[PDB]
């Protein structure tokens, strides 16, 4: 139908929103790595204070 200039069937918008999906699944997946860093540093605190 159309190429780049319809905002709901144009390639640019569609692909852009795929890039958003990748960006925010990447964001959500990027929070939780930092959460794992929080918990590792935590366990170090817990072993030290524990001792």
């Amino acid at each position: 139908d159309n190429a780049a200039d319809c905002a709901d069937i144009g390639f640019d918008a569609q692909l852009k929103v795929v890039d958003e999906a990748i960006y925010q699944v990447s964001s959500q997946r990027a929070k939780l790595g930092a959460v794992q860093n929080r918990l590792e540093h935590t366990i170090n605190n817990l072993s030290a204070s524990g001792e």
Partner: protein, 51 residues
């Protein structure tokens, strides 16, 4: 109705191509013309019409 090719991994990184010809591909201004300029590639006078 261009020939939008996708050329890049991002938006608007595309090439537009057009093409035309058929029996009426002789001279032209916006259309070919009437008595001339298409039938010079469809009818091609010399039936008796040079003598």
């Amino acid at each position: 109705k261009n020939l939008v090719f996708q050329i890049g991994a991002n938006a608007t990184q595309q090439i537009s191509v057009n093409i035309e010809d058929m029996g009426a591909d002789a001279l032209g201004i916006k259309e070919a013309d009437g008595s001339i300029a298409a039938l010079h590639s469809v009818n091609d006078l010399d039936v008796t019409k040079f003598a």
